[PDB]
C-alpha cells in the first residue's frame, strides 16, 4: 500500500520517497505536483491545413 517514486533533483547531483494514504476520500490526498506533460498546439497551431515552416505560407 506504499508508493515509492523519485523526488526532484537538488544540489549535489537516495532520490526516493515513500507515500501512504491514510484517509478514505481521494480529496484528502496531497497535491499531485509532479506531472509535466504539455502541448501548446491547441493555441499556437489552431489552423485546419498543416503548415510547413520551411514552405511559404500563402501559396
Amino acid at each position: 500500500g506504499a508508493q515509492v517514486s523519485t523526488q526532484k533533483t537538488g544540489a549535489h547531483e537516495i532520490i526516493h520517497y515513500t507515500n501512504i494514504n491514510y484517509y478514505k476520500d481521494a480529496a484528502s490526498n496531497s497535491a499531485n505536483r509532479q506531472d509535466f506533460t504539455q502541448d501548446p498546439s491547441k493555441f499556437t497551431e489552431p489552423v485546419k491545413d498543416v503548415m510547413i515552416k520551411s514552405l511559404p505560407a500563402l501559396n
Partner: protein, 238 residues
C-alpha cells in the same frame, strides 16, 4: 505508546506545504468529468502565443490605439531609424503588459529565446526593405545603421508574405536572468532601420503602419513564483 519527539517546525503553517488532511464531507459524490475544449496544462503554453506590442509610446498619444502602430513615410533620409527599444520583457513599458510580460511578472527568473514578428499593413502596391537588428549588451546602444548591422540582424523584404520573424537568440553569461533586470543582467537592444526606403505609385496614401508581435520560443522557461506588483487594493472589496 510508541515513543516520539517533536522536531523544529511543529504546528507551523507554511503556505506552500503538501500534507493530507481530513475531508469535511465524507463520501461526497462529485459530478462526472467532461472534456471541455481548450484545456491548458502549463502557463508556457499561454506565454508562447503572439500578442500585439505597444511600441509607439511617444508621451503625447491622445488616442490610445495609436500606440500599436509604428509610422512609416515615403520620403526619408537614406539611413533613418524606425524604432528602438530595450529588451527587458518583464520590466520595459513596451513589453510590461503584453501577454508574455504579464506571465513573466509572476516569476523572478527567466531564460530562453524570443520571437519578434513584424507585419506590414500598407497598400498592396507599396514596397520597401527594412533592417532589423539585435545588439547584445554593451556600453553604448547603436546610433547608426552602420553600428546596428554589426550585430544579429535580418533583412526584411516586403512582398506577398506580409510578415517576417526576428528570432532573438539567448546570449547570456548566466543560465537565468532576473525579471527585475538590473545592470548586471542586461539583455541588449533592438532597433529597426530603413534599408532601401518605401516607394509608392500614384494614387496611394503617403504613410503606412507596422505592428509588432512578441512571443516565446520552445526553449523558454521561468522560475521562482512571486506576487505580481501590477494589482493592489486599499480596502476590502464590497
Amino acid at each position: 505508546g510508541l515513543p516520539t519527539m517533536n522536531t523544529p517546525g511543529s504546528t507551523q503553517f507554511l503556505t506552500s506545504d503538501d500534507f493530507q488532511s481530513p475531508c469535511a464531507l465524507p463520501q461526497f459524490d462529485v459530478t462526472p468529468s467532461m472534456n471541455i475544449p481548450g484545456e491548458v496544462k502549463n502557463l508556457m503554453e499561454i506565454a508562447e502565443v503572439d500578442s500585439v506590442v505597444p511600441v509607439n509610446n511617444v508621451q503625447d498619444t491622445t488616442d490610445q490605439m495609436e500606440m500599436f502602430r509604428i509610422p512609416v513615410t515615403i520620403n526619408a533620409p537614406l539611413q533613418q531609424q524606425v524604432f528602438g527599444l530595450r529588451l527587458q520583457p518583464g520590466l520595459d513599458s513596451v513589453f510590461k503588459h503584453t501577454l508574455l510580460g504579464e506571465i513573466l511578472n509572476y516569476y523572478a527568473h527567466w531564460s530562453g529565446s524570443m520571437k519578434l514578428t513584424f507585419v506590414f499593413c500598407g497598400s498592396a502596391m507599396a514596397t520597401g526593405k527594412f533592417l532589423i537588428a539585435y545588439s547584445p549588451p554593451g556600453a553604448n546602444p547603436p546610433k547608426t545603421r552602420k553600428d546596428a548591422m554589426l550585430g544579429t540582424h535580418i533583412i526584411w523584404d516586403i512582398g506577398l508574405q506580409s510578415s517576417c520573424v526576428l528570432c532573438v537568440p539567448w546570449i547570456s553569461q548566466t543560465h537565468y536572468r532576473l525579471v527585475q533586470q538590473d545592470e548586471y543582467t542586461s539583455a541588449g537592444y533592438v532597433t529597426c532601420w530603413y534599408q532601401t526606403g518605401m516607394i509608392v505609385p500614384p494614387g496611394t496614401p503617403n504613410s503606412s503602419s507596422i505592428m509588432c508581435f512578441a512571443s516565446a520560443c520552445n526553449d523558454f522557461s521561468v522560475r521562482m513564483l512571486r506576487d505580481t506588483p501590477f494589482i493592489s487594493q486599499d480596502n476590502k472589496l464590497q
